[PDB]
Structures are given as C-alpha cells and as structure tokens.
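ZP: hey, is the 7E7 complex queued? I don't see it on the tracker
AM: it wasn't, my bad. submitting now with these inputs:
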Amino acid sequence: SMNPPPPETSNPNKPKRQTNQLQYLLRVVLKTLWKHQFAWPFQQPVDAVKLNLPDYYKIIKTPMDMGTIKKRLENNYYWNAQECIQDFNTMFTNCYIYNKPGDDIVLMAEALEKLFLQKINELPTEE
Ligand SMILES: Cc1nnc2ccc(-c3cnn(C)c3Oc3ccccc3)nn12
C-alpha cells in the first residue's frame, strides 16, 4: 500500500546527450500526448494510496509516467531516443498488465499510444 520513491529523473554520473531525436521526443511526441483529453491519469506517478490500489506496486515493478518522462527530457537525462521510447512503452504496457480490456484507463492509454505510434513513425534521422 505505500508508494515507492518515483523513478530517477536526475543522476549526474549517468551519461547524457541532447540530440535532434530526443528534441523531437520532447517538442513533438511528450507535447502531443501531454495536451490530449486522456493525458491526465498519466501526467504523474500512480499514487497507490490516494487511488486505493494497494496491489499496484506488487504487480508493476517498472513504473513509468509522462511526468517522469517530461522531467527526464527537460533535464536531459537520456543518452538516446530508444531509452525514451522504452519509457513510453513501459507506461502503456504497465496499464495493460494491471487493468482489463475495455476499462476506461485502458481506452485512455490506447488513445495516447495510437498518437505515440503516429509521431514516432516520423522520428527524424540522427544528424
Ligand atoms: C487504474 C490505473 N492503472 N494505471 C493508472 C494510472 C493512473 C490512474 C489514475 C490517476 N488518477 N486517477 C484518478 C486514476 O485512476 C483512474 C481510473 C480510471 C480512469 C482514469 C483514472 N489510474 N490507473
């Protein structure tokens, strides 16, 4: 039932880069999904206490959310685009693992994932 510490958004010894693909992931991918009508549940880590989901963190061992992704992109935490893409995929997968098909939260994740795939399809080549 307690909430774990949120995923790491700062790590000075972790190598980082600012590239055109990571810039695209913030400016295009991370803005398009953030502004969506169904973004709200995914804008911060899941609060297992407030949401009365005591089982959440016993099932979801790799939690992820757009709030964490936002901070990671803004504070230049990533080395490459694949690390960021993996975070988005982890967020959607966690939602599908914890919930059942047709659930409101699953429908919300599906709408965001559709857009995510549309935008990632246009990921620019590395400069
Ligand atoms: C379940 C479940 N599985 N992953 C997640 C991630 C976030 C949230 C979340 C955030 N705020 N509130 C009130 C939440 O609950 C719901 C429940 C149904 C629809 C919308 C939100 N729920 N959630």
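AM: back. Residues 19-123 form a domain with the Histone Acetyltransferase; Chain A fold (CATH 1.20.920.10).
ZP: great, adding it to the tracker
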